[model samples]
Every structure is written in structure tokens, then in C-alpha cells.
Target: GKRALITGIRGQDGAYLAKLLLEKGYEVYGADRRSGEFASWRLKELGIENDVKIIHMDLLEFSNIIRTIEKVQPDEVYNLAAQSFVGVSFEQPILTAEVDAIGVLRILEALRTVKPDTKFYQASTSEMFGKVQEIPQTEKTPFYPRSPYAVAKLFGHWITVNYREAYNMFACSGILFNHESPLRGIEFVTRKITYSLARIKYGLQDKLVLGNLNAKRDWGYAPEYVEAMWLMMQQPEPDDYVIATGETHTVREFVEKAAKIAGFDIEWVGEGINEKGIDRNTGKVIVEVSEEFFRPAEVDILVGNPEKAMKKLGWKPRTTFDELVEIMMEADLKRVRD
Candidate 1:
């Protein structure tokens, strides 16, 4: 029997991981400052709303974190908590820095003195490879953070590694790529794309507006990546791994995929932010690009080498690009009516 705590329990990954851990016969607990009446929407959607004990703990309060760790003393801690929008990083740079950067440090410190044996998993992002030092990022690749989010995540990643070597804590960082599901926050591009397309198909929304349709990302299903996170914690020795599908797809391709799932054939036209994804059959402008949705510092293609993950963890992603799009489309289609 094992005990675990997920810091950001209300999120997509948090809910999925909670379900996974509980199925394996582990007692699960979760921390979110927004607890009680702010019940986890995704957890109930996944039908595990009451499975995890939702506890209140603020990331900004160091003493509060120390107290939570000492109180629960969970055998495993998954630090999935963060202000995780790359696009909104510009507007909320300070808030993002506080949560994404300093928050990692706070929890690690708590674990060291109170519950050193707890296996810690840090939610590192592929965005750390933001101006990307190599074509397909590997564990050894140099990082060139482009935005406030990436820069903050960069700090979070290194700190996890630092504490591991410094104090010999069982800690690892998973440099996860763009993973999407129906439960994903509407702020993210993947869900925003699919969720909007589902509405357009239902005639609830007239058009889809997006930025950087040419920007390529390596994407995968969210649940599989959470298993990859669990794989790292189970290993005898701790090490970081990149969890991703090796295939790169542009935002245009993703937009088209979701549209296809919703029974629309998208015809991508125009250029840059002015581009339009027209409904091929009806000739309606169902999707359009806008500079307003674009990021201040655009990242080039983000594709990772998950070869290390395969060998070390025996983990390989199971879903295809089109398969993932179909999953989100189906989920949203069912939900859109309500």
C-alpha cells in the first residue's frame, strides 16, 4: 500500500493521476488552495471527485507548505501545481514566477526536512527548450527560455535536480510536451482548438480565432504522460525523462484534425495571423488567425526525443495525433449539449 499527494489536484493531469494512483490501490490526497466549494470539475468528469481527499494549502505560504507535508507525510508527492499558461505569462509574469518558480523550491524544502523519503515528481515543461538549442530536444540539450513562463519553469526544473544531487532526495523532473484532453483548461491551445471546433460544429460558436498556426508542437494524450510520470517515481534510482510523442504537428494541422472530427473540412488560406481556415464545403470562415492570440516571443518547433523515456521507463505513447483530436472532439461533443 502507498500514499500520495498531488499539489494541483483540480487540473487535468492531477485528476487523471489521482484516478491512476487510486486504481493501483493507493490512498490518494490532493492539495489545492481553492478547496471545499471549489470542487474539482475534472475529477467528477472522470468520476473520481470524492476519491481523493481535497486539502487546502497555499503555494505562496512556505510555512503552510511545510505544515501540509509534515501533516500528510505522503510517501509520494506529485508537484503538478503551477500557473501554467505560456500565453498569459506576459500579463501575469509576477504571479507565474511566484507559482512556477518559487513554489517548486518551497515544496522541495518541506520534503527535505519533514519527509525526505517521499518520491517527488516535478512537472517540467518542453517550453524550457523555448528558443530550442537542438532540433529534437534531448535531456542533455541546452535550454533557451523565451518567455516568463519558460524562464520560471527553467528555475523549477534545475531546483528539482539540484535538491536531488545535493540532498539525495528521490526527485525527478518530467519534461512533458503538449498533452491535451477534454479536461484541459480552456486557456491552453490544444483544448481551445478542439473545444471551440466542437461548438462550431454544434452551431454554438460562429468562428475559431487562434495565433501562430504555423508553430509546430509535439503533442500526445494527457493520461499516458501521467503514467510516464508514475514510471519515474517507481524506479529505484531517480532520473528525469521527456514524455512526448516524437511527431511534430502545426497548429493548422491540429485545427484541421479537430474540425475533421467534428465533420468539417477546413481549407487553410491567407498567411500569418491573417490566415483563415474556411469550411471547404460550405465556404464559411469557421476558423481565423489573429495577432491578438499570438505570444510576445514565439517559440520554434518543440519536438522531444523520448527514446530515453522508452529505454529507461519502458513507456511509449499509445495515441496518434488524429486519435487524440478525436478523443477531445468526442468528449466536448457530449459536453457541449449541457
Candidate 2:
């Protein structure tokens, strides 16, 4: 059995990847640094928390990463770790740049020193495709990052390419689009929408205030995305691919759909500041748009062309946006009930 080490193993993707690797008979080692609250909640949710061997690996420190790589000597290293939040990246650009961009470089060098043959998968984001230079982004699309997080991820994307060609290592990057699930971080808008709506449906939340309801995003399910990540690593030669559902939805649609899934006939009243999505049945405002919730450097119409990944890796997203909303809403509702 091949050994695999995943950074950010406590995250949604990492936990899902861990479960996949374990099912494939790979001995999974999760390298999770206690950057904040030490919750292996996702892994526990998957019932493989006890299976993955844990290590205290912080990417900020070179020695810690090198030590973990040396110890694990993994056949595959999935760099799922990052200071990953576009909104939070603005609050702490230095920390975001440090972990998201420089941290990727640190792990690549660490692998070079200790385990050059390790198949490396860097989790590059569509956030790197900020401002949407093209209608549907592919591996060839030019990037115009809008946020510090996007710029940092752009650096990581190129760095992965650099290390891949320069060292002739099995290092590849996946330019994954906005993928979410019930396991997704609550900070993310998708999860926040579902969690908030579920609570509101459960009478726990009064109202949810949002910004930029017109901001369009191409979302995919996390389980399918984690499979695409694994496929990139299995290729004989390392190459990049864009993984997405090749569809788009706005924040307004997300709220409407999620509220509908949560058993609300949500109706929009106005646009922008005066916009309020009220429940038609209860005559109460469920989601109210606010400028205060808006983040800096808002992106426009982010989607991807998954044909390349489909042709190369036989990977196609199976979950629809409506289905994803239901999946997330159901989980949050279950949590709220208990």
C-alpha cells in the first residue's frame, strides 16, 4: 500500500481525500498544524478520524514540513493546506501570502530535499482566475487575480509548475473552482447561507444579512472535487486541469434556492441596498442584502471549462447546484435539530 500525507487534513477536502485514499488501501497520514481550534470534525464525520495518522506540521516553518516529509516519506503529498478565505485574506494579507503562497513553496522544497518522487498535488483555486479574463476558464486562460488570496494562489500555481518542470518531479496543480459541501467551512458563503437558513428555518436565527447577491460563482460538490484532485495525481505526467461543473449561479439564486430547500418560498423584494428576500409564507425577511457584508475586490462571473479534465482524467462532476444546496441544507438542518 502506498502512503499518502495530506496537509490541512482537518479541512473538507482533506478529510474527503483521506477517506478516499483509505478506501483505496493507502495508508493516510494527516499533517495538520494547530493553527486554530483543533477540530478533526470532518474526519470524524467520515468515521476515519482514528485511521489517519496525525502529525503536527506547520508550513510556516520549513523544518516542521521537512521533518514531516522525512518521517512520512509519503508516495503522495496533497497540499490541501492554506490560510483559505478570500474575505479573511483581505484582513491579513501578510498571513495569507505567507501561508497560501510561500507555504506552497516551502512544501515543494521540503519534498525536493526528502522525497522528490512523491506525487504532489497543490490545491490551486479558481480564485486565481479572478476578474474572469475569459467566458469559461480552462488551463490556458490568463489569470487576473482580484484579491491578495487570489494573487497568492496564482503564485502557488506557477510555483507548482516551476518545481514540476525544473526538478522533473511528479508535481501537478488542480485549478479547482468553487467546490462546497456540508463539510465546507462555515465562513464560506455557501455554507453560511445553508447554515444560516437552516437555523432561521429552525427558529434559531432572525435574519441573514449578505452582500453582493449578484456575485456569480461556479460551484461543485466537494466529494466529486476530491476525486478530481486524486485523478491529477494518478497521471503518468504531471499537468494542470480546471475542475468545475461548467455552470454558474449568483448569490441571489443561491439564497433563493437554499431558502427554498429549507422549506421557504423566498421572494426577492428589491435590488442592492433595499433588496430583501422575504419568505412568502411567513411574510418575514429571511435574507436582507447589506453593503456592510461586501468584501473588497469583488469578482465577476467565475466559471470553468471542465472538458479538458473530462477528456484527460475521465472526471466529471455528478452533483448539480440545486442538489448541492439540498445536501448542505439537509446537513445543517440535521445539525440544527440535534
Candidate 3:
């Protein structure tokens, strides 16, 4: 009903949500920092580069945000914009706090000024449940953020609730876990493996290197997760929901699955810095390390209990990890071969 504005429209979620809304007959406006950047590629890929309105406005600029909101006058606003990346936060803490933390306040303030009636959705992450405060974290899980990214998300999360409760704004936060897809950046673990596997399969590369293969995470397909974001806003009563699969997979398992999908005979050998993926028949280092992928403060394990999302939103993830690996591998192979 009416137009919907996606803040990070160039990202995986933004592109998927825009396509979904457009298919459902909603005029979608995707706003981000500027053109020729990361999120812009999403619109280009969706073939909606011209269908949706793409505005170049940084979230740090409050005046620009309010002005844009006034111009678009959307019925719904999804604040998926943030300085996302756990390890990068260790280096860019101040920028992360400003973009991820203060950006929420900026969007809410803009909403209050222009589209107070607009249902606002904030992209909250399970990284806030860092430090392993609980197993299979629910909405009720207490957050003990380990890194700056997680800490900043906690700020954004509370601010969404604050605006909704105190200002009576229609705001909802979707605390999603580590969801991935073919659209995922290569730096991320799942995509890294998928991309590497594709390279190895196509004879473009010979190895897939990584750090901390033991860390377990509840990864899901991103397209499915964004559906939950829409469902979160549709609820009569706005509240937080944990959108995730109940199951978890270790990095070691993920590596093996990716290699297998690409038809590589992968076998791990040794431990620590010397650990690697051997070709089994040949002792070639199909996978090795440079300690570049390691994080300052790592999240060991994170699984979610998305019962609330399932019960209320009627959202269920149909794609399993194997399917995800397959899809990602196919896309990566196409990218390399084409």
C-alpha cells in the first residue's frame, strides 16, 4: 500500500525487498550514500536500476535524510543501512559508531520530522548476542556484545524500541543472524568459500584460504530473511523478532561442503597457522592461510530460536545450507566462467 523506501537498497536485502515490494505492486524508493558504490550494484543486478528511485544521500547527514523522507513520503521505511563487518569495526570503530549507532537516531529523527506514520524497520543483527550469553538466542536473549559492531547494533536496536515506545512510532527491529547468498560480499566466510570453490572448480584458482574454521554460526539465505523483515513491519503490534534457522554449522563443515559442491577432494591437515586443505591424492595446498581473515574478538558460536517469527510472521526458510552452497557455487562459477 503506497510507496516503500529501502535505506540500503543497493545491498542484498535492499535489492530483494525492492523486488518483492515491486512485485506486490508497491512503488519502491531505494536510498543510499551515492551511486557507483556497493549497494548500487544491487539495483543494477535486479534490472530495476531504472524502475526504483535511487537517491544519493549519506545517512550521517540528518538534513538530507529528513528532506528525502519528506520528498518520498513512504508508507514504510526499512533502515537496513549500517557500517556492517565485525573485523572492520576493530579498525573503524568511530565510523561504525557514527554510521551504525547514530544513524538510527538520524533516521528516527527524520521519520519524526517527515513520515511519523511510516512504519520503520531497523536491521538488527545477532552479533549483539555475542559473548555466548545464551544458546539458540531468542528475542528475550540478553546481549553481551564482544566487538564494536555488535555494540553499535545494540544501540540501534534500543533506539528503534525507544522511538516506538516513547514517541509512539511504528518501528520494528529484525534481529537477524549471519544470512548469506550469492549476492554476499566475497570477504564474508560463506561467500568466500563459495567464490573460492568456483575459482578452484573452473581452474582459475587452486586454493580457498580462511581463518577460524571452528566458529559456528546459524547462517540462512538472505532472500528468505528479508521476507521476515517485511513480515515484522506488517504485524499489528511492532516488536523485535529473531529471524534465523534453528540449526548451526561450523566453518570446517562449511569448507568441506563448498569444496565437495565444486567437485574438489578436500581434506584438512595439521592445526593452527599450518592448517590447510590438501588435495588428498596430491599434497598440494588447496587451502592455506596468511592470518588475514582473523578477527580481533571472534564470536565462537551463534544460533537463533526464531519461534516468534515463525509463529507470528508465517515465515519459514525453505533453503537449507546445502542448497545455499549449491546456489552460491553456481553463481560464482558463472561469474568466473562467463
Candidate 4:
């Protein structure tokens, strides 16, 4: 491929995917709305801000999306752009729908009008599998979204399907579950836990507080998941695939594991809602439940089934859940200790 256009290029997934495509011989072009330092910070941290071309284009502006696609003349376009906060979706439903749902349509319209031959991918999320339709959700799992973020992603997922069927475009959706790396944003749970635990280990913080420790999620490495995204576009046919590790772990387990790996011994002293962690050696309150950290509408247990991806795309995650947690904790130590 000569060139690739990546929307939301400053994000965790976008940064990784851009790196992947560039290394695979694609002239990667990234688009974002603003020129702020934080907006381009991920690109800089990943050491590819200088390597790829960055464009200022807002997906809400349909004309800008079309114009940018036309100008880039890309062989492939990955629509990873979205207001991706599942928890904040309740607070900002309208903006969430505008950015997460309508943004996909804008890019699809642009591709249809300007770059018809380009292979396209919409970054669909497993959060849309809210209400937990199945024990282990696959591509066939029926959507029952609980939050605004999931509802918005549901729209993006369908629009991608509509465009592919109606217009005959090479469009696909990667129904990715929770994948994390060191570069993960501060707001997300995994990164929050990892960074806070790292701080606690260094005496920078006394405790880490979080909500719903029982909420189980399927986790994987962001790098490997992004590889699955690129491979999806390279396929002969366009379709949806569920990308995940096919295993689940509770938030309690993650906190305990992360704390232990960081040299803290956390023990649960109370039961039920009163369950809290106390440092065994120091007799310190190391973790507690916080109502503030809780989402109004919760997605209780998400475990992605990647059987379809394995059989069709021949893709399986290269990293395990323990490996993912350790990798995140290791990066947090290095990052905060520096």
C-alpha cells in the first residue's frame, strides 16, 4: 500500500496501528482536530510524530473528512476516532453519540464519495456487548448496550456493515475488547490501576481506590490487537471479527496481582460491599471502594470469544492476561520512577 489514513491518530490504538502500518511500508497519515501538545503527545511518545504526516481535520465536519480522504489518496483508512470513554458516556450522551456514532458515518460517506477503493476499518468496541448477551461474546453475540458509549459504538458497528453491504466497499469492524499498554490514557481503569499501584509502591500514594472490583473483562495486549486490525483489512473479504484473549478476570484479581507484582502484599479484611484491601506487612489501608469511581450504568462481565477470528483471520492474541498486567505494571514503574 502506498498510503494509510488513520483517524484519531493521537489515541493509544491509533498510535500503535500507525506504527504497525508505517513499519509495513505504508506512508501513514494521522488526522486530529487540534494542534495542542497533548493531542499529539502519544505520537511523540511513540517516536513517530516526526515520521508520519499529521493533519488537522475534524470528523464532525463532513467536508473536512471528505477533503482529507481525497487529499491523502490512501489505500486503506482505519476509523479509530471516537469519544471513547465508556464511563463518561453517561455524563455526555449527546457528544458521545456525535463523536462515536456520527463520526463513523462521516468517514464512511467520505470514503464512498472520494476514496471508493480504499479498504476501511471502523474501531468497534466490545463495550457494545454490554448487558452481556453471552458468557463469552463472539462476533455472533447480539448487542445489548447499557451505556451511551456502547450505544454509540453499536451505531458505528452497524454503519460499517451498512456501507459494506449497500455500497459494496471493503469495510470491516474489529469488535475489540479491553486491550491495554503503557501508553494507555490516564482515565481508563487498567492504566489507572497500574499507575496508581506503581505510585503506591514508591510511597508516592498511600492507596488506590476503584469501583466495582467484580466486573470481569477479557484483556489482551494492545500491540497484538492492533496487528489483528491491520490483518482484517488485508483479507479478501470484508467482515466483522471479535478480537480478544478469550479469558476473563475480575477487577479484584487485577488489583491484587498488580499490587503484588509491585512489591505490596494486599489482603482483604472484610466481606461483601465492605471488602477492602489492607497492606499485610505495613498494616496500611492500601485499597478501598469508591462510589465516585463507579459508572452509573455498568457493564458487568465481558469475555470476548475470538473463535471466528481464529478460524477465519487465523489470528490469536500473542500475549496472556498475566503478561498484559505485568507489562503495564513494569511500564508504570519505569514511567513514574523516572
Candidate 5:
């Protein structure tokens, strides 16, 4: 049986990818930085925490990375670990640079020396196309990263390409857009809206606060997106692909949809930071805008053209926008109810 090692196995993407690998009969191992009380909730949520052998490997420590690679000797290595919060990147640029940019280098260098045959998959983000040079970004689109997080991911993406060309390694980057699920972190707007709205519906929370509702993103299901990541590694040749739904919707639209799913209709009033999403029937404000939640450098819109991924890897997103929102909202509602 093939053995696969995934970094950031506790994250939304890693857990899903690990489950996928296990379903395909691969022996899955995961490298996590956290060793304490913070368990793999996502893994347990998917009912596979026991199946994955978790190991401690810090991306910042070269020795730890090298030693882990040598010990695991994985058939495929998925580098999904990073300081993933874009808003926090402004305050933690150096840390983001270390983990997001240099972390890929650390893994690639280790693989080149310890195990060159191991296939590598880098978790590249749509944020790398920050300002977005094109309407629908493809592999050919020029990257104009707007934030430190994006800049770091930009380095990670190119380095993966460089190592592939220079060392003839099987390294691929997946420029995934806003893929979310019930496992998504609360810091992200999609999950934040869903989780908070669920609480609001239960009368546990009064309102949801958000920023830049007008900003647009192409959202898809996390489980479906991870399949594309696996598909990239299974190909005869390793190459980068933009994984997305090719449809863009704003944060406002997401909030509205989530509210309706939670059994309420939302109406907007005021503008800018003073804006509120009111319950039309109850005359209660359930959502509000805050400048504090806004990013210093904002990405107005991001949508990907998945044509390359579909054609090359035979991968396309299976979940619709409403389905994605419903999935998350339902999970949150269940959590709040219990």
C-alpha cells in the first residue's frame, strides 16, 4: 500500500484530503505542529482520527522537517501547513513569510535530499492573484499579490514550480479559491456568517459582524476541492491548476443566503460600517459591518477558471453555492442545538 504524509492535517483541507487518501487504500500519516490538547477535531468529525498516524513536524525547524521526511519516507507529501489567516498576515508578516514562503522551500529541500521520488503538493491560494490581473485567473495569469499572506504564498507557488523544473521533482500547486465546509475555521467570513447566523437563529447570539461585504470570491465545497488536489498528484505530469466553481458571489450575498437558510429573511439598511442586516419580520438587527474586520489591503474579487483542471485532471467541483452554504449552516445549527 502507498503511504502518504500530510502537513496541517488538522486543517479543513488536510482532513478531507487524508480521508480521500484512506478511501483510496493509501496508508495516511499526518504531521502536525500542535502536540497538546488541541486535537484533530476535523479528523474526528470525518470519523478517521484513529486511522491517521499523527507526527510532530515543525515547518520552521529544518532538522525536524528533514528528520520527519527521512522517517516517514512517504510516497506523497502534501504541504498544507501555513499561517493561513489573510487578515492576521498584516500583523504577522515575518511569521507568515517564514511558514508560508520558506516552509515550502524547507519541504522541497528536504525531499530533494532525503527522498527525491516523493510527489509534492503545495497548498497555493487564490490570494496569490491578489489584485487579479484577469477576470477569470488561470495558470497563465500574472500574480499581483496584495497582502503579506498572498506574497508569501506567491513565493511558495513559484518555488514549487522551480523545484519541479530544476530537480525534476513531481511538485504541483493548486491555486484554490474560497472552498469551505462545516470544518472551516470561524475566522473565515463564510463559516463566520454560517456559525454566527446559526447561533442567532437559536437566540444564543444577537448579531454577526463582518467586513467588506462587497468583496467577491468563487466558493466551492472543501471535500470536492481536495479531490482536485489529489488528482493533480496522480497525473503523468505535475502542473499547477486553478480549482474553483468559476462563479463569484459577494460576502453580502453569502450572509443573505445563510440567513434565509437559518429561517430568516435579511434586509440591509445604512451603508459602510454602519450597515446592518435586519430581520425583516422581527425588526431585529442580525448582521452588522465593522471596520475592524476589514483588511488593510483588500482583494475586491477573485474567481478562477477551472478549465485546465477539468480537462487535464478530469476534476470539477460537484457542490453548488447554495449547497455549500446549506451544508455549513446545517452543521452549525446542529452544533448550536446540541
Candidate 6:
């Protein structure tokens, strides 16, 4: 069987990808920096904790990364580990660069020296197209990153491309848009909206605070997106691909849809930070805007073109936007109820 090593096994994409690889009869090894704490909750949730061999590997430490690679000798390496939060990246830019930017270099360098034949998959982001140069960004679109996180990912993206051409390494980057699931972290706006809405329906939260309700994004299901990542690595040629749903929706639409599914009749009142979402039945503010939550430099809109992924990998997003919201809401509702 093929041996696959995932760098961020605890993350949403990592967990889903690990489960996918395991299901395909690949011997999976999960490399993570965290030696303590219960970080394998996603694996446990997927019921594959026992299937994946866990290894302690820090991306910041080159020696540790090379050592782990030497030991595992992975046939395929998915570098999904990074300081991924865009907002937090602004506060801790250096840490983000260290982990996201240079960390990728460490992996690529190690792969070049130790195992050049191992196929490398880099977890790139739509954030790289921060102030988007195109309406529907494709693989050919120019990157104009706005945040530190995106800037760091930009470094990671180009480095992977450089290595592929320089040393003839089988490396490819996936420029994935905003994909969410029940496994998504609360730090993300989509999960925050769904989880908070569920809690509000159960009377656990009074109001949901957010920023940039007008920001538009092309969202898809996380599980489906992970499949695209796998598909990219399976291709005969190593090249970057943009993975996303063709449709775009605003944050406002996401909140309204999720809130309605949670049994709330949400109506807007006021404007900007003064705006509030009122429950029609109770006449209470169920959603409020906070300027504090806004990003230092905002990416107003990001819609992607997945034609490349479709034509090349024969992969297209299966889950509808509404269905994705429903899945997250239902999972959150069940979690809150139990």
C-alpha cells in the first residue's frame, strides 16, 4: 500500500484527507507539532485515530522535519500545517511567516535532499488573492495578497512552483477557496455563524457578533475540497489548480440562511456597525456587527473559477451552498442539544 504523511492531521482538511487516504488503503502517518494535549479530536471524530500513525514533527525545526521524513519515508507528503488564521496573522506576523512561509521551505528542501520522488502537496489558499485581480480567479490569475497570512502563503505557493521547476520535484499547490464543514474551527466566520446560530436557537447565546457582512466568498464543502487536493496529486503532471464553487455568496446571506434553518426569522435594521439582526418573533437583536472584528486589510470579495480542476482532475464540487450550511447547522444543533 502507498504510504502518505499528513502534516496537520488535527485540522479539518488534514483529518478529511487522512480519512480519504485510509479508505483508499494507503498507510497514513500524521505528523504534528503538538506533543501534548488532545489534538487528535478530529481523528477521533472521524473514528480513524487508530488507523493513522501519529508522529511528532515541527515544521519550524528543519532537523526535526528531515528526521521525520527520513524515518517515515512517505511516498506522498501533504503539507497542511500552518498558522492559518488570517486575523491572528496580523497580530503575529512573524510567527505566521516562520510557520507558513519558511516552514514550507523546510519541507521542500528536506524532500529535495532526502526523497525527491515523493509527491508534495502544498495547502495554498484563496487568501493569496486578497485584493483579487480577477472576478473569478483561475490558476493564471495574479496574486495581490492583503493580509500577512496571505503574504506568507504566497511565499509558500511560489516556492513550491520554484522547486517543481528547479529540482524537478513532483510538487503542486492547491489554491482552495473558503470551504467549511462541521469540523471547521470556530475562528472561521462560516462555522462561527452556524455554531452561534444553533446556540441562539437553543437559547444559549443572545447575539452573534461579526464583521464584513458584505464580503463575498465562493464557499464549498470541506470534504469535497479535500477530494480535489487528492485529485491534484494524482494527476500525471504536477501543477497548481484553483478549487472552488463557481457561485459566490455574501456573509450576510450565510447568516440569514443559517439563522433561518435554526428557526429564527432574521430581519435587518440600521446600517454598518450600527446594524442589528432582529428576531421577528421576539423583537430582540439576534445578530450585531462589531467594528473590532473587522480585518486590518479586508479582502472584500473572492470568487474562484474551478474550470482547471474540473477539466484536469475531473473534480467538481458536489455540495450545494445551502446544503453545506444545513450540514454545519445540523451538526452544531445536535452537539448543543446533546
Model 1 lDDT at residue 29:
91
TM-score for candidate 6: 0.98
lDDT tens digits by residue: candidate 6, 159-276: 9999999988899999999999999989999999988998888888889999889999999999999999889899899999999998899999999999998998999999998989
Instruction: Give the lDDT of residue 148 in candidate 6.
Output: 92
C-alpha positional error of residue 84 in candidate 4 after TM-score superposition, expressed in Å: 0.7
Summarize candidate 2's per-residue lDDT along 1-338 as a digit string, tens digits.
99999999999999999999999999999887644544888887999979999899988999988998888889999999999988888899999999999999999999898988889999999999898888899999999999899999999999999998999999989999999998999888999999999899878999998888889999999999999989989988999999999999998899888888889998889867999988899899998877777878889789999998999999998999989988998999999999
Per candidate, the number of residue pairs that clash is 0, 0, 1, 0, 0, 0
lDDT of 3 at 203: 79
- 249-271, model 1: which lDDT tens digit per residue? 99888888888888899897888
Off by over 4 Å in 5: none
lDDT of 5: 0.93
Q: Estimate each model's TM-score.
A: 0.97, 0.98, 0.96, 0.97, 0.98, 0.98
Model 2: residue 324 alpha-carbon error in angstroms? 0.9
Q: What's the ranking of the predictions by lDDT, best on top?
A: 5, 6, 2, 1, 4, 3
Worst 10 residues of 4 by lDDT: 32-41
Candidate 6: where are CA atoms >4 Å away? 34-37
lDDT for model 4, please.
0.89
lDDT at position 232, candidate 2: 87
Residue 119, model 6, lDDT: 99
> What is the clash tally of candidate 5?
0
- For model 3, residues 69-104, the per-residue Cα lDDT tens digits are 888898999988887878899999999999999999
* lDDT per residue (tens digit) for residues 141-220 in model 4: 89999999899999999999999999999999999999999888878889999999889888898878888898999988
Candidate 6 global CA lDDT score: 0.93
Clashing pairs in 2: none
For residue 49, give model 3's deviation from the true position in Å. Answer: 2.0
Report the Cα RMSD per candidate. Answer: 1.3, 1.3, 1.5, 1.4, 0.9, 1.0
